[PDB]
Design a protein around this nucleic acid. Structure first.
Lengths: 416, 516, 452, 314
RNA sequence: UUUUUUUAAAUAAUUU
RNA sequence: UAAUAGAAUAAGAUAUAAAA
């Protein structure tokens, strides 16, 4: 019989199973305490004792993996969970740098040896890549081999549902602080499984249909194979919460799918919210502009161009009337909303205008006074011109303060 | 010859067996650079060991220039060395002095880092008040040397510097003025106020202050011409005794400002050419250029300047051959000797001239009568054929026009030039005429080439004048184009500017009229 | 060479690269440039961004890897001074870092990608083509940058600001990235149609090749390309004839009036055919499906005199094409088998499997090639698909190979991909052949999976 | 085939396929009739054949070349950004991705420029051919040793021919070149005169290697493998340590006892070995002599791309 | 013959 | 003890995929 060494990715159980189970129990207890908060010194004492136990367990495991030939004899799923726990306990700040590197180097060596043997299945490649790039652990040969093997699109065909969702969520959550070098390989994961997700279009939950879409759009990826995923969402509006509708509008705009008929339903669902915020109002205004830009005055339906325009303006005013409940975090939000309303000639009541200008007054005053904390000069010019167009009686303080800001020179330039 | 104790110390230093601090290596390098009695620079196995000692020591003890000097004295021998980069201070190491030292280290040792500049600036802002007046000027100078784009912080620093106008001296005022003028994005209000402050305290200025102010005004531009006025009035009483570099800067500012009061220009030029013999190569070149641009090269002017420049004509820099070559043109004065020496120098350095410089030289010598009977035409033809891959449209047009005007005959070169010009289309008629001129020397070209040439020239016939129409027709007939759309396009323009045919009309035009 | 500063060294390195990649590969210029660039350092001298980028590009082009000093110093400079790398020297840096695969190279490529994404609206005719080609050299998947660049290309091409060379570069750059956009390629085709006579044959063939490779499935432009190419046949070279053969096999539509003239011109220049041209023509004929014995005999005869010129790819393609059509040439097959035995270490992952299967399908067994390919299979087992692994295993079973050191890797690979291994119907017969030889004793788990 | 326009000038994936020598260190190899300049004096040959070792009178490399070679050795052990073409190496101390106080590399002539060029260096290959009775000489393999500062270990007594038992005849020589100045306090080579002719050209039993012990015992383990007569010859001629400059070379017999000291200076120490082998050399077993190399059968002559012929007396 | 866009978006789930 | 700057420039095949 041939000495094959193929172990299932998800029998041949060693002490690694027991060590990982102990780590699982400690992590579960710590998370249970963290949830039980919602006696801080007491819970931090218990966290200290649990992290001491976890550190002792991982020290014993790394000593065993160094001294005796355990990695070759162990299966493959144990390797997967060992990689998971080594890469996860570092983010929780329970491991030191030296021990973390010592474990990861030998895990990488074993994975490289098994790749050389050819046992690495079509799912283990995705798992290892996802759980290595997000930790930003660098090894030249491992990264190059994984990137080269992720271009065999034929292998990645029958991935399970849970594997798809877990990889997508793991890539999605840790996107802010990723180093630049990690970005590109990230994309090569999402497109490896793009066809499977595209075929999997009719099985995703309505909430997930948004998670996958966002995970793809944040990594500036809009593959063709994912086209039905969006279309179903357009046909399933009304099951989304109002806050989700703004994100849906942005996504549909970025997939070249946003049209008038879906825009009407999105605006309607936006207006059904109890109380609006900056996000939904800004998204609604952007959608109204991008749908108003799409009418041709000399096309096939040119004679129908003007009424449609009117309709858009009407559905703008519904949003425009309720513009005082929101709280603007930054000036560009106010400036975008006002540019949209002015250019498209939506009528807005004076009360919301006064609220908008009074809100902007505090921000410009803080910028002027503190001077220690980034309102550019062109944005300030635009705000001044908008206030002048709508009349300076709305906010007399803002005009004088704003002119004085121009006179002194607190506001920097765009070049700087 | 190394005696026993000297040899043993040499061996101990050779084996990296002695721990050396930065101070000791600096002292040894200073001794070596000062005196060469023991042959320190002549033992590679000794300076290699000293370099290994330097790498593994703490270089933060010594000043930045001491580290730069050790690096330079190791580079001179043949060892590639670079002092270590300084880390940004963290936590309580924060202080104005360390934040200035970071910039100074990056300045002297030539290790520019935009990320470290941005980090340092983001941490010096809160304590800007604690800074002393001299530290503000030092920071302004350092940021001006590093070509930082953060003009907002430089403006803030400049405002805080102006607030202490009384404390600062003339040298500090001039340094602040020039360092502000060098920053590109500085707001014009702060610039106006700084030039206003420079406008007063005018009598206190020294020659270094004059040089700094003139440099700043040359950098700024015509918009501050008024201030420059008070400068030329101020120096009207010292003009009979000034440094040659100062008068050269005056001429540069006169040319840049487009000054129009001619009496000051004439007086200053007359004072300059008295002591022009003291100028360096670069300053001599710029005095010549500025005098040319102001229309002041009379006979004695040109004679004196050429006599002064013929000294450096033997070893001219490649970047300085073309400007004086241009100045020798457009003037009705005899410059045969300067031309001959410059052509010889150009021949000497024919393997280091870039594509643009070669094109410029060939263009300038294109119409020169004595330049046809010289080896330069053949040498430059071979060089241009080699360099056709590195030539842009302007360089291609310049070189091809210069070679065609010089009588250089080489069909392969002109065919290759036509192909390279077909790679990127000809935007203008002046960029396309040299190709036709070159191809018409031989008189034959492959039919595909002439077809593409006709396709290119056809749209451009709508705006060219009558002389251009005649020249294009002559070139096309020489090449032998059969395409009718071209001839038709050339015909129409001719009519618009000339109504209908007449017996008086030139025969060629009348033929052009027949759309052959 | 000592009196030359770094700027002159950069200029001369660019000159040497331009002379070598265009006018011949003289093994003298390459070695002189290697020797000169092996003893240069950007240390202690102030240099512009363009000169450093030129030095990095000309060093990397001549074989210098990411371990060399010059490369390390240039990469460090490109990392530290990022705003000095304007949109003029971005393509040089990206092209240089394309083949280097390390941490710093990845970071630099990502930073330049974001910079070109932000300034995609202010580029002109030269910059769009240069940047898109440079980003096509490296393998990157920044879709948003591609969309912005395509939009700018359309806006520029509406007014007519592209030449024939620009069109070829843009078409190849956008086809290499697998960016399927119908409007952009329509605009490029319309710009070429407006150019009319300014596109010659040398600037026409790559256009058709790229337009076929992208695979737009638009039969309106394929016919126009065929009609335009029909007039230019008499001027074509042999390499161009093979290129249009491959291109119009890629298109997939049958144009008999064009194929006949192409065949006549190919027969006319039979003495100028190398092995590469013959392999390309036979692969194109295999793909399109037409069976033309008259040209096939001449191609096989000309392939017999250039046996020593055959590469691994050419041998693989020629043997597979000959085996598909059922052509028997015992001398050519024997010589190709011997040559493949000589260069067995040049086969890639899939070329080896294709060659072995093509040789095994016809009844031609030779120990010289069999042993070499079986031994070489160990280093390419790990880069195989399920169907390719099945084909390799069947070919190996036909060669009667029983060495466990050879059979363990392929059995491991086929066990790791068992689902796709047993879900391909077209190979089902092959499966029943394979276990007819080895039997249930060899790898029992695979047998248990087979029974289910 | 068709090589892309931006990949025309590249080198093969491994430098083994490169026929000849690149011009990196000393330019191009001299002509056929220009190989007589690098001949060595007969007295050096006699000294080698008598002592079992000898030092070349002239340094074989200029100081710039030694600097470049030291840079290559430094880059071969990066341990953060691993060396490209690391998979082209017979063995490495960084296979565990951790390294240590001693870095040893083999078969690096297929990995970096200059190291490949050093093999075809005329001054050493002509001398080695003269030692090998004027025959074609083929590279056996290279080796690089790098010892860290203040903690570098020492390799105890060994015989080179003890590692080459798979090769049938005794026809070899070793050339060792110093990439840094060496002395008894940093990795100096210590050899026993007249030891290559002790056991009738036989191999002494291997020494016992016990790490984590002082250098004195490691170098004193010699009294355990020798017999009484070898002890007397040792007493008459105790082992001699040889000082080497930044470029000096040393020829060693395959059968002479050989050791290197520890490193107690303040910087790492580097040295390089290259083993050269004669034409009339056969194998003993069936299979590859080195990992992933062409396999031989029975008593087959040793050739191929993996053992290139570096010099030919014709 | 022509049809393209401008958010800080953060709610998937698991023992891998 | 140590501080002076100039140039504007384009090469081109990796063995895949459904609708005005």
């Amino acid at each position: 019989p041939l000495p094959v060494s193929y172990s299932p990715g998800s029998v041949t159980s060693t002490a690694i199973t027991a060590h990982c189970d102990v780590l699982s129990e400690c992590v579960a207890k710590a998370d249970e305490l963290a949830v039980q908060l919602k006696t801080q010194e007491g819970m931090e004492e218990f966290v200290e004792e649990l992290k001491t136990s976890a550190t002792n367990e991982m020290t014993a495991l790394v000593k065993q993996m160094q001294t005796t030939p355990l990695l070759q004899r162990a299966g493959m799923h144990e390797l997967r969970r060992t990689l998971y726990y080594t890469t996860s306990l570092k983010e929780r700040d329970w491991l030191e740098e030296k021990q973390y590197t010592a474990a990861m180097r030998m895990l990488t060596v074993e994975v490289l040896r098994r790749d050389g043997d050819g046992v690495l299945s079509a799912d283990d490649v995705l798992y290892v890549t996802t759980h290595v790039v997000t930790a930003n652990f660098y090894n030249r040969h491992l990264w190059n081999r994984m990137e080269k093997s992720l271009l065999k699109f034929s292998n990645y065909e029958n991935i399970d549902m849970s594997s798809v969702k877990a990889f997508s969520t793991r890539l999605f959550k840790t996107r802010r602080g990723c180093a630049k070098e990690t970005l590109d390989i990230r994309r090569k994961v999402l497109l490896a499984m793009s066809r499977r997700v595209g075929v999997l279009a009719n099985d995703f939950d309505l909430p997930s249909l948004l998670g996958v879409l966002q995970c793809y759009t944040v990594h500036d990826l809009t593959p063709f194979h994912l086209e039905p995923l969006a279309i179903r969402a357009t046909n399933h509006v009304g099951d989304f919460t109002p806050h989700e509708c703004a994100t849906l509008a942005h996504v549909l705009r970025k997939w070249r799918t946003m049209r008038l008929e879906v825009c009407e339903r999105l605006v309607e669902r936006i207006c059904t919210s109890d109380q609006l915020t900056h996000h939904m109002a800004n998204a609604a205004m952007i959608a109204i502009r991008t749908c108003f830009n799409q009418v041709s005055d000399g096309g096939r339906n040119a004679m129908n161009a003007e009424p449609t325009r009117q309709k858009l303006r009407a559905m703008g005013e519904q949003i425009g009337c309720r513009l005082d409940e929101v709280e603007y975090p930054a000036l560009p939000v106010i400036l975008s909303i006002l540019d949209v309303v002015v250019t498209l000639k939506i009528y807005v009541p004076k009360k919301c205008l006064q609220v908008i200008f009074s809100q902007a007054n505090d921000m410009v005053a803080i910028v002027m006074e503190q001077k220690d904390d980034p309102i550019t000069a062109e944005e300030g010019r635009q705000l001044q011109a908008l206030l002048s167009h709508y009349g300076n009686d709305l906010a007399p303080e803002l005009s004088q303060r704003m002119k004085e800001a121009f006179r002194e020179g607190v506001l920097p330039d765009e070049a700087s | 010859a190394r005696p026993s104790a000297l040899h043993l110390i040499f061996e101990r230093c050779k084996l990296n067996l002695v721990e050396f601090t930065a101070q000791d290596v600096y002292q040894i390098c200073t001794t070596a650079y000062n005196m060469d009695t023991l042959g320190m620079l002549q033992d590679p196995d000794f300076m290699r060991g000293l370099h290994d000692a330097f790498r593994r020591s703490d270089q933060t003890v010594i000043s930045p220039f001491q580290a730069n000097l050790i690096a330079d004295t190791f580079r001179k021998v043949g060892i590639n060395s670079m002092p270590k980069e300084v880390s940004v201070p963290e936590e309580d190491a924060i202080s104005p002095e360390s934040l200035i030292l970071v910039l100074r280290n990056m300045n002297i040792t030539k290790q520019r880092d935009e990320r470290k500049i941005n980090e340092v600036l983001k941490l010096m802002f809160p304590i800007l008040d604690e800074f002393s007046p001299t530290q503000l000027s030092l920071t302004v100078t350092e940021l001006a040397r590093l070509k930082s784009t953060n003009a907002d912080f430089v403006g803030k620093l400049a405002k805080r510097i102006m607030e202490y106008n009384d404390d600062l001296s003339a040298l500090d005022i001039s340094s602040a003025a020039v360092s502000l003028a060098y920053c590109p994005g500085i707001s014009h209000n702060i610039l106006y106020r700084m030039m206003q402050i420079v406008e007063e305290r005018m009598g206190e200025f020294q020659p270094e202050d004059y040089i700094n102010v003139l440099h700043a005004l040359n950098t700024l531009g015509p918009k501050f011409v008024n201030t420059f006025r008070k400068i030329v009035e101020c120096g009207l009483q010292h003009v009979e005794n000034m440094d040659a570099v100062t008068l050269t800067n005056y001429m540069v500012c006169f040319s840049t400002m487009d000054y129009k009061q001619r009496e000051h220009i004439d007086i200053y030029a007359d004072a300059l050419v008295e002591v022009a013999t003291d100028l360096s190569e670069k300053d001599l070149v710029m005095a010549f250029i500025a005098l040319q641009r102001l229309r002041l090269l009379s006979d004695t002017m040109f004679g004196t300047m050429a006599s002064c420049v013929i000294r450096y004509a033997a070893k001219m820099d490649p970047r300085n051959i073309a400007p004086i070559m241009d100045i020798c043109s457009t003037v009705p004065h005899a410059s045969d000797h300067l031309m001959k020496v410059l052509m010889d120098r150009a021949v000497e350095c024919t393997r280091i001239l870039t594509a643009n410089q070669l094109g410029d030289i060939l263009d300038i010598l294109g119409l020169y009568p004595p330049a046809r009977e010289h080896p330069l035409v053949q040498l430059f033809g071979k060089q241009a054929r080699l360099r056709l891959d590195l030539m842009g449209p302007d360089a291609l047009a310049n070189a091809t026009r210069g070679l065609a005007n010089l009588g250089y005959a080489d069909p392969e070169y002109y065919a290759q030039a036509a192909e390279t010009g077909f790679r990127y289309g000809f935007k203008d008629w002046t960029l396309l005429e040299p190709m036709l001129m070159g191809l018409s020397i031989t008189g034959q070209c492959p039919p595909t080439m002439v077809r593409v040439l006709g396709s290119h020239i056809a749209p451009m016939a709508r705006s060219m004048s009558l002389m251009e129409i005649e020249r294009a027709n002559r070139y096309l007939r020489r090449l032998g184009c059969e395409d009718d759309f071209v001839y038709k396009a050339m015909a129409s323009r001719v009519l618009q500017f000339v109504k209908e045919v007449t017996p008086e009309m030139p025969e060629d035009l009348q033929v052009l009229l027949q759309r052959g | 060479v000592s009196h030359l500063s770094a700027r002159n060294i950069a200029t001369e390195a660019l000159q040497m690269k331009k002379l070598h990649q265009e006018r011949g590969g003289n093994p003298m210029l390459a070695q002189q440039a290697r020797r000169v660039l092996f003893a240069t350092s950007i240390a202690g001298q102030n240099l512009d961004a363009r000169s450093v980028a030129l030095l990095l590009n000309t060093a990397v082009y001549f074989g210098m890897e990411s371990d060399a000093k010059l490369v390390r110093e240039c990469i460090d400079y490109c990392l530290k001074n990022d705003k000095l790398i304007t949109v003029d020297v971005l393509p040089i840096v990206v092209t240089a870092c394309a083949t280097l695969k390390s941490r710093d190279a990845r970071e630099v490529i990502e930073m330049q990608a974001q910079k070109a994404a932000r300034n995609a609206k202010f580029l002109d005719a030269k910059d769009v083509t240069n940047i898109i080609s440079a980003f096509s050299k490296t393998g990157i998947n920044h879709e948003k940058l591609f969309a912005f660049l395509s939009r700018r290309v359309q806006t520029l091409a509406r007014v007519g600001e592209f030449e024939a060379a620009h069109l070829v570069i843009l078409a190849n750059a956008f086809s290499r990235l697998r960016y399927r956009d119908k409007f952009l390629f329509g605009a490029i085709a319309r710009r070429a149609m407006s150019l009319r006579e300014r596109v010659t044959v040398n600037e026409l063939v790559p256009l058709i090749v790229a337009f076929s490779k992208i695979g737009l499935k638009d039969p309106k432009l394929s016919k126009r390309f065929a009609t335009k190419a029909m007039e230019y046949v008499d001027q074509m070279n042999a390499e161009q004839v093979a290129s249009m053969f491959m291109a119009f096999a890629y298109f997939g539509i049958r144009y008999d009036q064009l194929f006949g003239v192409l065949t006549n011109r190919a027969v006319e220049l039979i003495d100028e055919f190398n092995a590469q041209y013959i392999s390309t023509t036979l692969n194109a004929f295999q793909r399109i499906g037409i069976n033309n014995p008259e040209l096939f005999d001449n191609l096989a005869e000309r392939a017999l005199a250039v046996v020593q010129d055959h590469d691994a790819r050419d041998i693989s393609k020629t043997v597979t094409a000959l085996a598909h059509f059922g052509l028997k040439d015992e001398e050519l097959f024997k010589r190709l088998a011997s040559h493949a035995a000589s260069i067995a270490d040049q086969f890639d992952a899939m070329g080896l499997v294709n060659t072995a299967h093509a040789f095994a399908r016809t009844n031609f067994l030779q120990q010289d090639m069999a042993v070499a390919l079986s031994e070489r299979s160990v280093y390419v087992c790990r880069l195989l698909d399920a169907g390719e692994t099945r084909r390799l295993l069947w070919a190996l079973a036909k060669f009667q190979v029983r060495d466990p050191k050879i059979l363990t890797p392929v059995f491991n690979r086929c066990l790791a991909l068992h689902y796709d291994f047993f879900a391909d119907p077209t190979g089902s017969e092959e499966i029943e052949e394979i276990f007819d030889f080895y039997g249930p004793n060899f790898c029992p788990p695979l047998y248990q999976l087979y029974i289910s | 085939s068709y090589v892309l326009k931006f990949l025309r000038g590249q080198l093969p994936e491994d430098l083994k396929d490169v026929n000849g020598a690149l011009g990196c260190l000393y330019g191009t190899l001299p002509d056929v009739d220009e190989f007589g300049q690098f001949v060595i004096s007969p007295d050096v040959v006699n000294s080698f054949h008598q002592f079992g070792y000898v030092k070349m009178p002239i340094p074989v490399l200029d100081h710039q070349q030694i600097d470049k070679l030291a840079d290559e050795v430094n880059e071969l052990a990066n341990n953060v950004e691993h060396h490209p073409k690391t998979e082209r190496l017979y063995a490495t101390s960084l296979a565990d991705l951790t390294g240590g106080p001693l870095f040893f590399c083999q078969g690096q002539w297929r990995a970096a420029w200059g190291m490949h060029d050093l093999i075809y260096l005329p001054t050493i290959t002509v001398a080695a051919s003269q030692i090998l009775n004027n025959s074609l000489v083929r590279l056996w393999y290279d080796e690089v040793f790098m010892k860290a500062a203040r903690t570098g270990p020492c390799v105890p007594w060994q015989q080179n021919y003890a590692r080459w038992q798979h090769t049938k005849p005794v026809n070899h020589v070793t050339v060792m070149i110093a990439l840094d100045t060496m002395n008894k306090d940093r990795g100096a080579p210590c050899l026993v005169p007249g030891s290559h002719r002790w056991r009738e050209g036989g191999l002494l039993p291997p020494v016992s290697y016990d790490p984590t012990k002082d250098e004195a015992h490691q170098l004193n383990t010699i009294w355990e493998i020798i017999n009484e007569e070898e002890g007397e010859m040792l007493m008459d001629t105790p082992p001699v340590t040889v000082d080497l400059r930044r470029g000096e070379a040393l020829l060693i017999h395959p059968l002479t006892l050989f050791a290197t000291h520890g490193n107690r200076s303040l910087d790492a120490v580097r040295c390089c070995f290259i083993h050269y082998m004669g034409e009339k050399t056969y194998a003993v077993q069936n299979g590859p002599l080195l990992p992933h190399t062409t396999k031989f059968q029975a008593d087959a002559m040793i050739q191929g791309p993996f053992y290139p012929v570096v010099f030919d007396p014709a």
